[PDB]
A paper describes a structure:
P-type ATPases, including ATP7A and ATP7B, are responsible for active copper efflux that is essential for maintaining copper homeostasis in mammalian cells. These two proteins are also known as Menkes (MNK) and Wilson (WLN) disease proteins, since dysfunction of ATP7A and ATP7B leads to these diseases, respectively. ATPases contain six metal-binding domains (MBDs) that share high sequence homology with Atox1, a chaperone delivering copper to ATPase, and exhibit similar copper-binding properties. In summary, tetrathiomolybdate (TM) can react with the metal-binding domain of ATPases (WLN4) and form a Mo2S6O2-centered protein dimer.
The reaction of TM with Cu-WLN4 generated a yellow complex, and the product was purified by size-exclusion chromatography (SEC). Pale yellow crystals were obtained using the sitting-drop vapor-diffusion method. The crystal structure of the TM-WLN4 complex was determined at 1.6 Å resolution. The complex forms a protein dimer linked by a Mo2S6O2 core. Two Mo atoms are bridged by two sulfur atoms, and each protein subunit provides two thiol groups for the Mo-coordination. The Mo atom occupies the copper-binding residues (Cys14 and Cys17), preventing copper ions coordinating to this site. The Mo atom is coordinated via a pyramidal geometry, and all eight distances between Mo and S atoms (2.3−2.5 Å) are in the typical range for Mo–S covalent bonds. The two distances between Mo and O (1.5 and 1.6 Å) indicate the formation of Mo = O double bonds. Inductively coupled plasma mass spectrometry (ICP-MS) measurements showed that no copper was present in the crystal of Mo-WLN4. The absence of copper ions in the TM-WLN4 crystal structure from Cu-WLN4, together with the TM-induced dimerization of apo-WLN4, indicates that TM binding expels copper ions from the Cu-WLN4 protein.
Residue numbers in the entry:
A (entry chain A): 1 to 72
B (entry chain B): 2 to 72
The structure:
Amino acid sequence: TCSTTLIAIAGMTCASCVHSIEGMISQLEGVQQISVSLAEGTATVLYNPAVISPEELRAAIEDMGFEASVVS
Amino acid sequence: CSTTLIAIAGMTCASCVHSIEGMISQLEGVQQISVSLAEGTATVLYNPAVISPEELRAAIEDMGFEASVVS
Ligand SMILES: [Ca+2]
């Protein structure tokens, strides 16, 4: 079964980037779905914790040039 | 839900109005959309946890109509 993680993402200011983040993160092994809220500055990720971790997700987002933090 | 008003240029037929309604209304997070051909606008009721005015506007633009968020 999937777990959920909430990640704060700073610096998102366009639709293009929302879609780019969702595309990149969704394709990682174990990621079922990612919902980015441009309004709230967050991503909610449904993932298989046996194969990927919140800190791996966070790190992938950072690598795209956004500051990111696992909230919960 | 939140509400956004989007100005859309170039709506000059019923078929396009309905196309935009269909495409936008079916996006995840979108509860309702009303398009005004006379006023050149769409009013969208949406869940900001899931979708933004910026994304709505970009989706309309991707269909071939110039769009801007008014409020
Ligand atoms: Ca999305």
